[PDB]
Every structure is written in structure tokens, then in C-alpha cells.
Amino acid sequence: IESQAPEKLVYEPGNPLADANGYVKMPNVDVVGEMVNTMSASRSYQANIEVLNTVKSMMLKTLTLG
């Protein structure tokens, strides 16, 4: 889903995309938020990979019970 936060708009009558007042709208992205999202996603990815690896090893070890 696209965010509903208000979008930044700058005064540039030159660009044809400008409206009647000359305000052209640009995306509103928090670069800090994106960097932190990348780091947290990477950490969760690694954690889930490791959990899967441990569970696979345990299953393979219990496959030879006896």
C-alpha cells in the first residue's frame, strides 16, 4: 500500500507537471527510515535462516534415532 502521508511539493513553474500554482509534487521518503528498514530486514533474514538451519540439523539428527 502507498503511504497517506502528505507529499512534499516544490515551486517550479518551468516543469510541465506543475499545477496552476506551479507546485510540482515529489515523493516523501524518509531516508533514515529506509536505511533502518534495510538493516532490520537483513537481521531478521539472517535470524530466520539460522533458525531453519538449526531445525534442519536437529531433524536430520533425530532421523537416526537408535
Binding site: 502521508a5 502528505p6 512534499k8 511539493l9 516544490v10 515551486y11 507546485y23 531516508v31 533514515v32 536505511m35
Partner: protein, 259 residues
């Protein structure tokens, strides 16, 4: 980043103001110039959080966020003040006392209005301005003219060898606008009418709020160097402050992306 996209507008505004100051300083010795001043205006403001009222007698601050957008130059208004008069002793120079401009016909049929009084006679006798553009009423001057005189109400007369009496050769009226500030200015010191100003009205000098005419004098530019220098100093300091803002935001962004 909003910081860069705002400081860019700030620097652009300061640059345009410096250009206006430079032009005012540059054309200081020209005849019949009215100084200009550029006015800026802040853009619209975006509200991210509404200022939620409390009214709990806690004396708390209003918690409302509202980011700015920048500044744009909205207009550059010229001051139509009466400048000083300098004497050139040339018999064919007119200085206007009050308000009003002569009508000058451009080569493409349209008419342009100017306040610069410096007239020279062409090969055919029509009174034209320096540059070839002629006056719309088309004052004519005969040959072997002993001396040319121009009255205080725009009556131009010349004296011949005899007849013991001057003979008139034309009339020099001038036009007035309801709002002279709203005129678009083109080179050769020409002003043309836009929708901002009303339709011009023609009248003889001295009537309907039209200034008189003095012969042998020209109107100097009304430029004030004592304030142009101060405006220049403030422009330079503001430019440096905005540069510091750009440097700070660049440094913090670089620190952000270091990791």
C-alpha cells in the same frame, strides 16, 4: 532532501536580488531611470500534525508541526519618483516635471512610452530619439531654423529669418497611465502597457495631472548608492548563511550514509 531543495531556493532568491542591485548600480548615469526593488514572498506551509488543543490549564505548548517550503521572488517594483535635473544646454532637450511619458512609435506599428528626454532631428525634420525611434505626434522642424524653443505646455515653435514673429510648428502632448508601476520595460528605455496598467490617456502638459516641460535639461536616474551598498552587504551575508546551511546538511547526510 528538503533542506537542499529549500536552500537552493534561498540562494536563487539572493542571486536575483544581487542581480537587481547590480543593474541599479550599473545604469546609474543614464538619463531618466527609475530604480527597482525586488520583493520576495514565502511559499505555502504544509501541516503534518494538527495543533491539538488541550485547554487543561497546564500552560503547555501547542504541539503542531508545520514545515516551510521556501521563498520565491513575486515582483520587482520600480519607484516612479522625480529625479534631479541636469543641464546640457542643448536646445532640443526636454525634462518632464511631474508624471507622464512621451509616445514613441515602434517600427512594428505598436507604440512605446519613454521618459528619457533627448531628441535629435532626423534627415527629414521629424523629431526622433537617439536610436531612430520617432515621436508619435511627429513634430516637424523646417530648415534654416534660427532657434528652436519649446513652451511650458508642450508648444514647440521656431523663428525664421523674418516675419518679426515666431511661427508654431507643432504640439508636444504626452500620455499618462492610472498605474505607471504596472508597465513592462524593454530596452532603449521603453515602457509598454500591460493589463496591470490602464489604457493611456493623452493630454497637453500642465493639464489632467500631466507635468510641465523644461527645455535644456534632462532627468537623471533616481538611484541611491548609499542604500544600494547596504543592500549588497546584506545580500552577501545572507548568501553566506545559506551556504553554511547547505554545508551543515551535507555533512550530516554524509555522516548518515557513512555506515
Amino acid at each position: 532532501i528538503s533542506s537542499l531543495w529549500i536552500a537552493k531556493t534561498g540562494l536563487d532568491a539572493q542571486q536575483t536580488n544581487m542581480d537587481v542591485i547590480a543593474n541599479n548600480l550599473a545604469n546609474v548615469s543614464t538619463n531618466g531611470f527609475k530604480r527597482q526593488r525586488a520583493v520576495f514572498e514565502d511559499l505555502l506551509y504544509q501541516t503534518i500534525r494538527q495543533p491539538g488543543a488541550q485547554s487543561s490549564e497546564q500552560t503547555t505548548l501547542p504541539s503542531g508541526l508545520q514545515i516551510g517550503t521556501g521563498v520565491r521572488p513575486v515582483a520587482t517594483e520600480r519607484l516612479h519618483s522625480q529625479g534631479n535635473l541636469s543641464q546640457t544646454n542643448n536646445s532640443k532637450d526636454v525634462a518632464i516635471k511631474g508624471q507622464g511619458f512621451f509616445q514613441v512609435m515602434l517600427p512594428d506599428g505598436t507604440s512605446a512610452y519613454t521618459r528619457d528626454g533627448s531628441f535629435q532631428v532626423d534627415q527629414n525634420g521629424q523629431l526622433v530619439t537617439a536610436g531612430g525611434f520617432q515621436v508619435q505626434p511627429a513634430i516637424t522642424i523646417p530648415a534654416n531654423a534660427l532657434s528652436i524653443t519649446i513652451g511650458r505646455d508642450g508648444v514647440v515653435s521656431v523663428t525664421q529669418q523674418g516675419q518679426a514673429a515666431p511661427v508654431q510648428v507643432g504640439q508636444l502632448n504626452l500620455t499618462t497611465f492610472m498605474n505607471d508601476t504596472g508597465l513592462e520595460s524593454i530596452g532603449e528605455n521603453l515602457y509598454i502597457e500591460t493589463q496591470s496598467s490602464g489604457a493611456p490617456n493623452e493630454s497637453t502638459p500642465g493639464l489632467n495631472g500631466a507635468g510641465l516641460l523644461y527645455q535644456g535639461y534632462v532627468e537623471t536616474s533616481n538611484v541611491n548608492v548609499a542604500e544600494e551598498l547596504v543592500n549588497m552587504i546584506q545580500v552577501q551575508r545572507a548568501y553566506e548563511i545559506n551556504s553554511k546551511a547547505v554545508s551543515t546538511t551535507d555533512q550530516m547526510l554524509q555522516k548518515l550514509t557513512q555506515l
